[PDB]
Symmetry: C3
């Protein structure tokens, strides 16, 4: 509530480190055009497309604000500081502000274009706090507050999908008009505020394990429980006849002991060597990929269950569609090379989670007897058994922050398979739009739809602030620990900075799990 | 506590719709004979029966009252009203009343029979509130308060099973005498009251989903995560040599995106076409049916996990033993025709739950390399993985209401696989019985068991009342919704009414899931 | 805090039975030598050992106190009394005391040895209440308070493992120095006290089931739900053509009814007959055993999921590595005979848990049609499905009491697969050590490590006391129940006593599950 010559809000950014929590705030500049010429448009897949790539939905004239990525909040120094001293963290509070809003009209009369101020034009903004519109965040889409504060960004367009029977629709499909919501209209001088509180959520495990499930015992003392170790006879003359013999497992026969827990569930995936020539010479993806199909159409499990990337001393094999792959700065979005991308590694969970390329184990599948020898079968898909303990997938400075747990009758582990915190009531989606300004109407009344508007766009500043709780580490380890560092060697340009052309880049992915804990 | 000429209780029936809850009450007339001639009888399976159809137990002279079906409480108009405006519901409170009790003696001297009043005879009634007798409700048995209030019904006989080693018993087996319980004896003039409160239970999802798991994203914006899309070379001269290539999934390649969740667990079942000639010409049931065996004996999963009946545009295939099948009025209980039954459809859960006839997907099962091409295997049985989200089976106007969760150390999803609400402490079983009236004893004392009683039966009125909580719908859908209606076309008789012979019938099954929600 | 001639603490032992809880206390005498000559020693597996039997870790000069076994607390009469009247139990409170501590010096000058008092020598003791050192309890190791109170026992040595890449280590490995902890030093006259409270934990099911999952219904009343029972035609002339026919399942066709729940998850294991000649003539163990591998190395599931040992009337087959095996008194720890060990039976869970030797069932794996007949596949590995109900493994008088649930992001059923109660914060490990007493130092200062100490050991008394909650049984069973008893027949020596040589022995394993309950 001000005039045209008074600024609303200021540029805050920065971050504050307190005793048990950190407040990270960031401000950016945003631009917004008009979408679909102020029209809601039905969108069907295509005539003759693939059965799996079918979809029906709508596209609206509304934009929305995305900040669901760590790099859209944290900074490389702040991230390194957070992960090198903490065993966990989670969000606590959220604040959002829109200000310094300008609506600018555009005129075209020739090859040149002219831009002028339009002080009387409003802008509509509203937040879906009741979670009634479809939630499109948490799908790893583009367009959150660029990692560099100096970058000016663009508000993505909003759209949603619904039930479809092929390329068509069904009566059960829903249509949502976003103008049918109470929304706030604001001019140059007004501003929008919003506050939100996260619900209880488990701390993210920002640490590795210094122990292993299979090696969790005393290396000095035998077990007092007996196990069958021989079926033939040890004594002379009985080595060719059956006789059950029982031993006690000690430090030597350490693989035959009794145990309390089992490794996490498995869903096997194919393996690929980072060297091109070492792989099979065929286009096997989508024909040899672990995929799941529902309603008669297939789909690919890209993240999949949290499972270790490779074994020890491999460093060369990665599962097909088994880990997040990021893009380097200035990389094509279609058929990029292996050296132009950034494949994340989840080896830290080798201790608890089974490796993705290999199997869960073997199970007996017959009744052995004198005539028939015992036979087993390898099992590659494993559900949930009692006593199972596993670890969740790590999050990265560039990765997703949260997701919306679907409103369904059943859940097993609501932790998102792509990233961090799953929330029943996540931060609501803020949607912003430019109100349509009609051009000169006809002098004689006409009932026809008005389809001659004045072309104009908008720009402004958006501030976000999240308060995060931190879990401190108290480890009794004697020797030092592994931590994130910058290489001291000479380089043309330093990491996480701008080049001579002023383009910000991220060289490597950074994971949180660096400190250690005992199982 | 009254005389012989004063009535206890009245006929209430009807239902009341309040702001956030509905009170449904119904009164019926019941008859009760004497069972087993006032004797407890041991019952074994048979000599020479099938191994799977073996059982040992007891049958008592006690009846019991059953009202564990929606049609025994609701009415077609009330049911349609409930399901067309609500997103859920659950039971809150229960009241039960027995009154207007008459004991009538029967005399036979010739082909004719005479019935007289017997004012001094009592009736025993008691409720197992401590859950000590076996719970036989929740097994889809016959004999609850008929759907039509004017119908007079019959109290079913009580019996139970125990451990058996073949047709015989084991020392671990238990015997329960129901006369060994504190019970209330009541004459003509007395009445029995009972009140009960349901424990906390999740709301039943009386809605479908307007979105799908595989289509939950923005149809306009690409993903920023890379995925391997090619193994050969795209450039000329490299189409026959291996080279990993990575792309970004957008609206076109919508089946290759990253996702957070997986469809519910699966347990595959055989498929049957509703057309007889389209099926295989063999007696495959019980020889090609998904069955589970314990203690060395098999058993059939009739409901099975909640899984979609068929794909889109099928409308003709149903799983074998994969959905509830109801009987039409006046239908034989042995080898009825397909047109004389009523097969329920669970297609509403196609969005989340996998189809029953098809598989969960495929999983890689080898280590591909230059020499060996990758190989996958189809998986038809799937356990529980992290990130799994599913939906429960719908309930119907004629279906079961609740069940008793077994008292065991472990549970995964205590929702009954046949129907609605699972309860650790369900409504207790009320048991009623006619006390034995001896005939004239011998003049000289004899220690022999008294086995000459006076033949008589009982009749009375039973009132039930359940208070149910309701969850209102607040949807932002623009277009109208699908709802239950009666066909306006001319017909000989209208649905859910009596015919010229005064026989009440139910033409079709009615499911609760009609409104929609976003995932 | 006393002198040299005043005793600290007394010998309590005994047990008290109160209305709803039992307090079991026991005192023992312990001895303690010096370990590793007061040195921390790195321990690697070996050069050329098996890949699976690889390990890296450390061994310390510290002892620790173990009392994680029922026989180290209860007594045969107390155990029999507990299991013959109770439906459950769990720990409530813990108290621990160390007193009457003497440090004795040893001198060797010839074949003879002399032992003298050393009043000025201290002893170090501390409890890891913050759970920072690796937890080596709960691995079925040797050395808890002997079952007979008169036996004097030996304090086991402490050691731990860490991450290893083969026989070597990795930078992520941790080293813990136990001298780096605040510890209490105590002489002859001082004593150590400790108190602890268990966290909430489910009652242990010390009962069997009088009913079965597959037989949980009324043996007298048919079901009102129809099931496909025939695919051919029953009428004459249609027995060779397809026609779906539906029936109602009653007491006769009791294996084709509808049900609410499924048996627990399965993980098949091989079967062995107790008769040697009836088994296959090969050394199949470890080559036909259900095993799971992680980080590229295998491991054996000795307890495995809680699954029934055998079917009815078998009494001769046991799963390979599927139940706890105890040793008889004076039995060799390497290749003992079948008659010299004690194999526990878990048949009591046949009602709910599937048998270990057999499969979970069969699942359809194709689309049957006119041309192709339906085909099914047997499933031996089963995950977790909705509606699954199972039972946990029984505990024994000689078996483990508790275990430490690993600190991980995910758990399915934290009940240990080897035994009883899983605890996030179990009773902490008390560690005790003899401080090093230097021998005469050189007259001239030398910076070399001091490696000439005085040889001496320690002895003392340790008292433990646990308060346990009890769940009373209120069963309506008429006939008597099965209970534990001692055979009245004449014998050379009675059970659970000492022989002519004063050696205490345990003849048979005792399980808690003796009383019964309905599902």
């Amino acid at each position: 509530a001000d005039g045209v010559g008074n600024s609303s809000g200021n540029w805050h950014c920065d971050s504050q480190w307190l005793g048990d929590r950190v407040i990270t705030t960031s401000t950016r500049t945003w631009a917004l055009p008009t979408y679909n010429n102020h029209l809601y448009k039905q969108i069907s897949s295509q005539s003759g497309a693939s059965n799996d790539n079918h979809y029906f939905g709508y596209s609206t004239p509304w934009g929305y604000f995305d900040f669901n990525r760590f790099h859209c909040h944290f900074s490389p120094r702040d991230w390194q500081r957070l992960i090198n001293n903490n065993w966990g963290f989670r969000p606590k509070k959220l604040s959002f502000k829109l200000f310094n809003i300008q609506v600018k009209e555009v005129t075209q009369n020739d090859g040149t274009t002219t831009i002028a101020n339009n002080l009387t034009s409003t802008v509509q903004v509203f937040t879906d706090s009741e979670y009634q519109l479809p939630y499109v965040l948490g799908s790893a889409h583009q367009g959150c507050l660029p990692p560099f504060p100096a970058d000016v960004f663009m508000v993505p367009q909003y759209g949603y999908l619904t039930l479809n029977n092929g390329s068509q629709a069904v009566g059960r499909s829903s249509f949502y008009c976003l103008e049918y919501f109470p929304s706030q209209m604001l001019r140059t001088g007004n501003n929008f505020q919003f506050s939100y509180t996260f619900e209880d959520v488990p701390f993210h495990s920002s640490y590795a394990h210094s122990q292993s499930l299979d090696r969790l015992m005393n290396p000095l003392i035998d077990q007092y429980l007996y196990y069958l170790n021989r079926t033939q006879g040890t004594t002379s003359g009985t080595t060719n006849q059956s006789r059950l013999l029982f031993s006690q497992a000690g430090p030597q026969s350490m693989s035959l002991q009794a145990r309390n827990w089992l490794p996490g569930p498995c869903y096997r995936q194919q393996r690929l060597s980072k060297t091109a020539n070492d792989n099979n010479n065929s286009n096997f993806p989508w024909t040899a990929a672990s995929k799941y199909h529902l309603n008669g159409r297939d789909s690919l499990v890209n993240p999949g269950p949290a499972m270790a990337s490779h074994k020890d001393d491999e460093e060369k094999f990665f599962p097909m569609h088994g880990n997040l792959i990021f893009g380097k700065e200035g990389t094509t979005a279609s058929n990029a090379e292996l050296d132009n991308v950034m494949i994340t590694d989840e080896e830290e969970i080798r201790t608890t989670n089974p490796v993705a390329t290999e199997q869960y184990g073997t199970v007996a599948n017959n009744l052995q007897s004198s005539n028939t020898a015992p036979t087993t079968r390898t099992v590659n898909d494993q559900g949930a058994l009692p006593g199972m303990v596993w670890q969740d997938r790590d999050v990265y400075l560039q990765g997703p922050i949260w997701a919306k747990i679907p409103h369904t009758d059943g859940h097993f582990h609501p932790s998102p398979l792509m990233g961090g915190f799953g929330l029943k009531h996540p931060p609501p989606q803020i949607m912003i739009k430019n109100t349509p300004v009609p051009a000169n109407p006809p002098t004689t009344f006409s009932p026809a739809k008005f389809a001659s508007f004045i072309t104009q766009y908008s720009t402004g500043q958006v501030s976000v602030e999240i308060e995060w709780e931190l879990q401190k580490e108290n480890s009794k380890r004697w020797n030092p620990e592994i931590q994130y560092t910058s290489n001291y060697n000479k380089s043309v340009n330093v990491d996480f900075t701008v080049d001579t052309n002023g383009v910000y880049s991220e060289p490597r992915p950074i994971g949180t799990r660096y400190l250690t804990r005992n199982l």
